[PDB]
Amino acid sequence: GIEMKPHPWFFGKIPRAKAEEMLSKQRHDGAFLIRESESAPGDFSLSVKFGNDVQHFKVLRDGAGKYFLWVVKFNSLNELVDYHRSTSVSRNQQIFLRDIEQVPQQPTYVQA
């Protein structure tokens, strides 16, 4: 298609709505985006379609000079996105972080 270098995982201060909205459109479970807080500094919330609706994880700053959802610390969102890759991000069940974007496939024209 025309998907150039998937950007991890930026949805600039995307309106809580717009986020939830489309992000809700998601079929399966594990669609996420990290929306950059308007003015706030290193404020990042990881949204995930946690069934029934859209959940959001405030990747807070500080704690010990770093980002931390609830507990486990991390210097890089990747470490986060990654950390919550094998062990999900919710005991209630099993969650997995997947690109909130379906592959670019082959737009128009099939095979050749």
Side-chain angles (χ1 to χ4, degrees), residues 68-83:
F68 66 96
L69 298 133
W70 289 40
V71 173
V72 302
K73 297 176 180 180
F74 32 56
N75 303 39
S76 181
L77 293 173
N78 303 84
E79 183 60 27
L80 195 159
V81 180
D82 182 24
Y83 183 89

Side-chain angles (χ1 to χ4, degrees), residues 1-54:
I2 188 173
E3 185 294 293
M4 296 180 90
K5 179 181 179 180
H7 299 330
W9 311 252
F10 188 92
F11 289 63
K13 61 181 180 296
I14 193 69
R16 181 181 300 162
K18 193 286 189 291
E20 297 180 293
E21 302 294 336
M22 71 189 270
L23 179 56
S24 182
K25 97 201 183 66
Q26 295 296 1
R27 198 68 179 84
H28 299 269
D29 60 347
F32 69 97
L33 58 80
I34 294 177
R35 59 188 181 195
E36 182 180 82
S37 302
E38 183 64 90
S39 302
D43 297 26
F44 299 94
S45 59
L46 198 171
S47 65
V48 181
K49 182 176 176 63
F50 181 28
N52 186 224
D53 62 9
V54 177

